[PDB]
Amino acid sequence: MIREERLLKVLRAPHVSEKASTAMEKSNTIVLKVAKDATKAEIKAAVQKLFEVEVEVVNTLVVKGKVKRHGQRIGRRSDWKKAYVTLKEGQNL
Amino acid sequence: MKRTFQPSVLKRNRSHGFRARMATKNGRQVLARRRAKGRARLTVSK
Amino acid sequence: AVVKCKPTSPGRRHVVKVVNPELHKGKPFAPLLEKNSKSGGRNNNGRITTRHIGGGHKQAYRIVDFKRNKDGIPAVVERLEYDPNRSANIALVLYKDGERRYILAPKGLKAGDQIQSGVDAAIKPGNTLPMRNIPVGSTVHNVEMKPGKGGQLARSAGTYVQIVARDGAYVTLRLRSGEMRKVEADCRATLGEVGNAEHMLRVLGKAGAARWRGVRPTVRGTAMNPVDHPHGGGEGRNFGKHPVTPWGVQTKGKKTRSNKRTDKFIVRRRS
RNA sequence: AGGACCGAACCGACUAAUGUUGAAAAAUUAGCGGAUGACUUGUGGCUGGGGGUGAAAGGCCAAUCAAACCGGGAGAUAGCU
RNA sequence: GCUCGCCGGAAGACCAAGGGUUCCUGUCCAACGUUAAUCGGGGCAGGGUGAGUCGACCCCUAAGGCGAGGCCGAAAGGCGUAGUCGAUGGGAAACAGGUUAAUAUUCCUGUACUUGGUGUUACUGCGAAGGGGGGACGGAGAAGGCUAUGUUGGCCGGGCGACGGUUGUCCCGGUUUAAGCGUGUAGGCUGGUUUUCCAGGCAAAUCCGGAAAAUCAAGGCUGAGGCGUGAUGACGAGGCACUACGGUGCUGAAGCAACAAAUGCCCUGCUUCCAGGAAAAGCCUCUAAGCAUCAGGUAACAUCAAAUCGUACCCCAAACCGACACAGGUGGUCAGGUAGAGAAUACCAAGGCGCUUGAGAGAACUCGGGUGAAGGAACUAGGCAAAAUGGUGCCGUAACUUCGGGAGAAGGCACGCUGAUAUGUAGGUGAGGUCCCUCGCGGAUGGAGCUGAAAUCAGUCGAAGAUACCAGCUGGCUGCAACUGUUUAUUAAAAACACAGCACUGUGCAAACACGAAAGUGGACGUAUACGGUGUGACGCCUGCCCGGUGCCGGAAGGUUAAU
C-alpha cells in the first residue's frame, strides 16, 4: 500500500476552469493539480482516501510552464501536473 | 539554398554535449575553462 | 561457356559473360553463411589504407572448408554454387554422417560425385590428402604451407600447383607464379585443379561493372598536382621523372621483398 | 535485356535576359542535360590540419582553404607607410 | 455578405526533423508589422495538450562507439577480448461514431483485442549466457485475382424554374457504415504418414541432418478479397420546435446494382538475371546439469495490472535552416472530375488563398510580352536572342556501319462534327434461367444488362479539325574525345578526369603496400585467373631503330671504402 505521508503530499489544488467544470457536470471527472512526481496509482489512492469517494480511473497530463516577463526580465513559470480523475456513479466531491 | 546549420538535437548532444565533453581529457579541460570563466551554460544540453 | 553479348546499347558491345548452367539457381545453404561487412579500404584508424575500394554489391560470406579435416568419411557432392567472395565456384558436399560443408570446386567435379579426405584416400580429383602420399608430378590445389593450418596456395580459379620433388621431409612445388617453393610434406593438398578456368576470359564491358565489384576509379598520377603525387604538374602532359608509387618508391622494376625468414623455403624466385 | 530511347517527380546546371546599395553574400524567368543507374535521397556512423577526402579542380573540409577555425607564444618582426 | 480572380501531384490535408506556447479566448495599439490598423504569429491576462492498443521508454541488433582483464605506448594515451551501448532495421495489442473556442485511434457511446501477475480446477515430465528451425530479408519483368476510388443506372427526398422552351430520353442532392469475430476462396509453396539405424549439430536429444524400408496417395502451410456478423445500432438529404440569430435540441427517407479501375493488397509470391542480395531477439522446438508423488508445463475460468514521458500549434513554412513576416533550402504520407498515355498540361471539386502600401496619370527610358508592309542573316565575334518545328496512324527512308544502328533519317498523306454499316460493331464483363454433381465462395451452357475501341462509306461546317495548353527544326563537310558518366559549391562542364580494354612492374602470404613511436588494422576471412603500383585508354590496322646519359635489375673478380 501507499503510506499516508506520501499520499497527502500528492494532491495540491482543485483545478478551476470551464473544461474542468464541464468535466464535473457532464462526465463525473474532477480535475485537480497534483504533485509533479505523482503517479496515477498515488492520485487514485489519494482521492480514494482523502475525499472518501470511489475512483474509476485517472488520466494525467503535464502542463508546461509559460515564459513570461517582468519589464525586460524573462522567466519560465514552472511545470505542473493535472489529473483528470474519473469517479464512479456514486459521488459528490 | 541549403545553409550550413541543419539542426539535429541528437547530433548536437552526441557531438558537443556534456556526457561527450566529460568522456575525454580535453573536453574536461573545456568544461574547466567554461566553469572558470564562469559561464551560465557549460555545454549545449538544453 | 563464354558468351559475347550482342551490341545493343554500348556498354553491352564489349561484354563477355561466363555463364554456367550447372551452378545452383537459388539460395545458398544457410548455416554456412555469415555476415561479411564491407570496409571501404579503411583500417581501424578510419584512414584509407588500400585505395580504390568501395561500393559494390552486398555479399554474404560462405564458410569454405579449407582444412578438410573429416578424414576417411566419404562425401557426395550435393551441388555447385556461385561464391561471391572468390574467383572459383564452391561445391556444397554432404558427408555420410549428415554434415554439409562447402569446398572449393575442382575442375571436373559435378553433382553426385564422391570425394574423400584423409591418408588412405584414392588419388582422383577432389580428394584432399597429405603430400607425402601424393605422387610426384601431379597437379594439386588448395595446398597447405604449415600442417594443419588450411589451404592457402592455388585457391583462385583455374589454378593448380605441380609437385616436382619429395626430398626428405619436404616437397618442392612449382607454384602458379613460376616459383619453386619447399613445403613440409605433411601438409594436406587437394588433387586436381580448381575449376572455373574460363573466369579469366570475361570482359566486363563497361565502367559500372568494375564499380559493382567494388572497385572505385583510379586517378593516374600524372593527372594530379605536385602536392598530390610525385608525378604532378606541368603545363600539358609533362612526365620527366622515374616512375614511382604515390609514396616515392620506384615502380617498374624495384624489388620489394624483404623477408629473410622464409628465404630458406624459396628454391627459385619466379621469372 | 539495356551504365537502352522519349518524358514528369527527382538530381543537375548548357545558354540568354533580369538582378548586380539584389527578393537572393549565386537566385528568378524562358529554353537545357540525366532520369533503372558509376542514379538519387532520409537517418545514424567513420576519416582532421602538412592531416583528411579527392572519377583530380589545388577541388572540398560549417558563406573561410597553395595548408581550417579557436586560444596562446605575442606588443613576432616590419631598414616600410 | 454578395460578386470577381488564383492554386488544386498544391498555394489542399496529415506528420517526421526543427522550433517551443506561435494554439484558443478576452483585452491594448506605445514599439514590432516596410503604410493605416479597430487587426496580428505584437503587449497583457486567463485557458488549453487526458492513452494497456499511437510514438518514445522497453526487448534485440547493424554501421560504429566504449571497453573489466589484456596487448601496446616517455606521460597523456592507442587498440581490443568478455561484455555493454547504438536505429535509420526486427519485436504484443483499437476501430467506428459523437464532442471542445482550443485535445483526441487518448474524452464519451458502442463493439473489441493483447501481454503479464495471482488464485482455483483437470491433465501433465519440466528445465538453459547450450543444439535445430524460424525471424531472414537482391535487381528487373510479367500477368492474374482483388480493393481503394470513380462513372452510370435504380431507389429516395426536393424542384418545375427572372429570358424562348422545360411532366421528362428533364434538373439538384443523398445513396455511408470500421476494427474484431466466423467461414474459407482466386492464388503460392510442399508429397504425406509409420518403424528401424547413424563417424554429424563441442556433451545429450524424441528436435535438425543423414541411411534404409513399409504404406497411402492425399495431407499440411500460407493467402488477398468476397460473404455473414458487428449493425432491428450509428450515420444520413432534409424537415419540426425554440431561437442570447451565433445556432440549440427533436425527428429523419433511400441507403442498391452494373461497369471502369490503381503506382495500394495477394506478393517477403512467380518468372528471370548476375552484380548473388543484414544481424540478433521475440516465436516454435530438442534436451544437459538439476527437480522428479514438489517445482514447473499445458488448457479452461476468475481476478488484478499494463507504470513513466510525448500528445497544443507551424511543419515546402510569416513558427524550421537562410540577420528580415526574405521570390531560396527542407524527408515521408493522401492524391477527386473532365480531356489526356500520364503524377505532364488546361479548366475545375474538397480545401485554401488574393502574396501588409495605396490612389492617379498613360511622357522619355528600362523590364516582361503581342503584332508587323517589302526584304529575309544583309545583324554579328558568332543566327546570340527570337521565329520555326512539334501528336497519333499509315506510306517511305541514303551514305556509312562494330550489322545493333544511322532512323523519329529525310519526305509525305489522313485527322472535326453527324449518319449508316451496328435503334453502338469487334472486344471486355456477365445476371436470371437451364444441366450436372465429389453440393458450393462449384464447374458447363446461356446470353439479359453494362462498358466499348477502331475502320469504311455517305454528308455537313469553318480561313483553319494534331484547332487551346502541351508538343523534335532538318540536312551536308570536318577537328577532338570511343560510348553512359565525373569535375573547378559561387565567372571554366571541356578536347580535361574517369572508363572498359591493353602493357609493364612488384607481390609466395606473418604477401607487397598503407595507416600506426608500438600493439594492431586495412590489403582479405582474399592466395598469383589474386592483390598493389604505374602508364596508355572501346574497337580496327599497328607499335620501327637507339642501352652512350639517368634509373632499375643482375654479377662478383679487382680498386676504393665506416663503426670495430
PDB file of N, CA and C (backbone and C1' of nucleotides) in Angstrom, chain E residues 155 272 305 344 391 482 495 528:
ATOM      1  P     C E 155     -36.543   3.802 -59.946  1.00  0.00           P
ATOM      2  O5'   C E 155     -36.282   3.793 -58.374  1.00  0.00           O
ATOM      3  C5'   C E 155     -36.542   2.643 -57.552  1.00  0.00           C
ATOM      4  C4'   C E 155     -35.937   2.848 -56.184  1.00  0.00           C
ATOM      5  C3'   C E 155     -36.386   4.128 -55.459  1.00  0.00           C
ATOM      6  O3'   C E 155     -37.604   3.997 -54.748  1.00  0.00           O
ATOM      7  C1'   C E 155     -34.044   3.944 -55.319  1.00  0.00           C
ATOM      8  P     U E 272      12.572 -19.305 -64.786  1.00  0.00           P
ATOM      9  O5'   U E 272      13.445 -17.998 -65.070  1.00  0.00           O
ATOM     10  C5'   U E 272      13.673 -17.489 -66.401  1.00  0.00           C
ATOM     11  C4'   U E 272      14.196 -16.064 -66.345  1.00  0.00           C
ATOM     12  C3'   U E 272      15.628 -15.901 -65.888  1.00  0.00           C
ATOM     13  O3'   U E 272      16.575 -16.094 -66.927  1.00  0.00           O
ATOM     14  C1'   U E 272      14.294 -14.393 -64.708  1.00  0.00           C
ATOM     15  P     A E 305      -6.291  -3.158 -10.773  1.00  0.00           P
ATOM     16  O5'   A E 305      -4.894  -3.241 -11.513  1.00  0.00           O
ATOM     17  C5'   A E 305      -3.629  -3.117 -10.823  1.00  0.00           C
ATOM     18  C4'   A E 305      -2.500  -3.550 -11.739  1.00  0.00           C
ATOM     19  C3'   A E 305      -2.330  -2.733 -13.012  1.00  0.00           C
ATOM     20  O3'   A E 305      -1.640  -1.520 -12.788  1.00  0.00           O
ATOM     21  C1'   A E 305      -2.175  -4.993 -13.548  1.00  0.00           C
ATOM     22  P     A E 344       0.916  16.002 -63.007  1.00  0.00           P
ATOM     23  O5'   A E 344       1.610  16.138 -64.391  1.00  0.00           O
ATOM     24  C5'   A E 344       2.985  16.065 -64.491  1.00  0.00           C
ATOM     25  C4'   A E 344       3.377  16.660 -65.816  1.00  0.00           C
ATOM     26  C3'   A E 344       2.671  17.983 -66.225  1.00  0.00           C
ATOM     27  O3'   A E 344       3.296  19.124 -65.655  1.00  0.00           O
ATOM     28  C1'   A E 344       2.673  16.416 -67.994  1.00  0.00           C
ATOM     29  P     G E 391       6.001  15.241 -82.722  1.00  0.00           P
ATOM     30  O5'   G E 391       4.519  14.989 -82.231  1.00  0.00           O
ATOM     31  C5'   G E 391       4.211  14.870 -80.856  1.00  0.00           C
ATOM     32  C4'   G E 391       2.828  14.302 -80.660  1.00  0.00           C
ATOM     33  C3'   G E 391       2.597  12.952 -81.307  1.00  0.00           C
ATOM     34  O3'   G E 391       2.984  11.883 -80.470  1.00  0.00           O
ATOM     35  C1'   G E 391       0.811  14.430 -81.855  1.00  0.00           C
ATOM     36  P     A E 482      40.138   8.746 -76.548  1.00  0.00           P
ATOM     37  O5'   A E 482      39.047   7.713 -77.076  1.00  0.00           O
ATOM     38  C5'   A E 482      37.786   7.569 -76.352  1.00  0.00           C
ATOM     39  C4'   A E 482      36.648   7.521 -77.331  1.00  0.00           C
ATOM     40  C3'   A E 482      35.241   7.718 -76.818  1.00  0.00           C
ATOM     41  O3'   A E 482      34.898   9.023 -76.418  1.00  0.00           O
ATOM     42  C1'   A E 482      35.220   5.885 -78.286  1.00  0.00           C
ATOM     43  P     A E 495      34.729  16.787 -74.212  1.00  0.00           P
ATOM     44  O5'   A E 495      36.034  17.005 -75.074  1.00  0.00           O
ATOM     45  C5'   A E 495      36.641  15.891 -75.618  1.00  0.00           C
ATOM     46  C4'   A E 495      38.115  16.090 -75.741  1.00  0.00           C
ATOM     47  C3'   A E 495      38.849  16.414 -74.441  1.00  0.00           C
ATOM     48  O3'   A E 495      40.095  15.696 -74.504  1.00  0.00           O
ATOM     49  C1'   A E 495      39.341  18.042 -76.020  1.00  0.00           C
ATOM     50  P     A E 528      46.691 -18.588 -56.045  1.00  0.00           P
ATOM     51  O5'   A E 528      47.195 -17.911 -57.373  1.00  0.00           O
ATOM     52  C5'   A E 528      46.366 -16.867 -57.933  1.00  0.00           C
ATOM     53  C4'   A E 528      47.153 -16.061 -58.882  1.00  0.00           C
ATOM     54  C3'   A E 528      48.183 -16.780 -59.743  1.00  0.00           C
ATOM     55  O3'   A E 528      48.284 -16.154 -60.996  1.00  0.00           O
ATOM     56  C1'   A E 528      49.264 -15.180 -58.401  1.00  0.00           C
TER      57        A E 528
END
